Write a protein that binds this ligand. Structure first.
Ligand code: BL1
Ligand code: HG
Ligand code: ZN
Length: 256
């Protein structure tokens, strides 16, 4: 099944998942000079005060912090979005080297990594029904750069030990995702897709302009994770990122 290697990577996904070549695929290059400041766009509202994390899983491509999403607690609304969207999970995409890893790029610039907080549209009942809808998901993309430690990431950094290999999960309660946000909520927005298979075209993307900084030691630990399961030849979880895809007529809008 799919991966990020020479024989199962992004260039191979289209065969099992035809939509890999579809009309609204992610990620894309954000051409900052072509993106249009949109005044019809209400301010963003990120409300993570009640967010209830349950666990962190190595899924064989990334690790997911998962959230209790059967009540309205950690919610995204405002900006490009109509109604409310509930936080289901967060995860990252990173490189082997500081010079790559982000999925979205900004005037062709690849950041060291990118965080996705994944939210689903409440009017659709649950995650599984939302991903059948064109406005089913909202993902908040946040860029990572290597510099100072991000304090609010360190609790994730240290549990990674427990979930080195594919399949492993660990209890991960009381994590506050607010720690992971930059100061400014300025963003770009476009209609797009999951960046992994099934690659469903159900996402409103909201990519924040201001990266967070993480430390070199922080990113390094990310890179100690494994693509293989326990007992297998060791493939190191690096370069788990899809490259930029064709914009295709679509317009990216700036919130600023
Ligand atoms: C392990 C698989 C299986 C699965 C099931 C439900 C939700 C996410 C999810 N997975 N992982 C993802 O990384 C994922 C899910 C949704 C999205 Cl919107 C994205 S992403 N990369 O467009 O932000 C990733
Ligand atoms: Hg969809
Ligand atoms: Zn992602």
């Amino acid at each position: 099944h799919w991966g990020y290697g020479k024989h199962n990577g992004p260039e191979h996904w289209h065969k099992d998942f035809p939509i890999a070549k579809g009309e609204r695929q992610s990620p894309v290059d954000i051409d900052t000079h072509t993106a249009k400041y949109d005044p019809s766009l209400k301010p963003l509202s990120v409300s993570y005060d009640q967010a209830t994390s349950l666990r962190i899983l190595n899924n064989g491509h990334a690790f997911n912090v998962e959230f209790d999403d059967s009540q309205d607690k950690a919610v995204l609304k405002g900006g490009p979005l109509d109604g409310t969207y509930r936080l289901i999970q967060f995860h990252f995409h990173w490189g082997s080297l500081d010079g790559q890893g982000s999925e979205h790029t900004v005037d062709k610039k690849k950041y060291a990594a990118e965080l996705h907080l994944v939210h689903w549209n409440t009017k659709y009942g649950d995650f599984g029904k939302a991903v059948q809808q064109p406005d089913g998901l909202a993902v908040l993309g946040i860029f990572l750069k290597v510099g100072s430690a991000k304090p609010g990431l360190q609790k994730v950094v240290d549990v990674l030990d427990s979930i080195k290999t594919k399949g492993k999960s660990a209890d991960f309660t009381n994590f506050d995702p607010r720690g992971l946000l930059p100061e400014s909520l300025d963003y770009w927005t476009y209609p797009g897709s999951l960046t992994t298979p099934p690659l469903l075209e159900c996402v409103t993307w909201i990519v924040l302009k201001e990266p967070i900084s993480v430390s070199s030691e922080q990113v390094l630990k990310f890179r100690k994770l494994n693509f293989n399961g326990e007992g297998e030849p060791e493939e190191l979880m690096v370069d788990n990122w899809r490259p930029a895809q064709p914009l295709k007529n679509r317009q990216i809008k700036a919130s600023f």
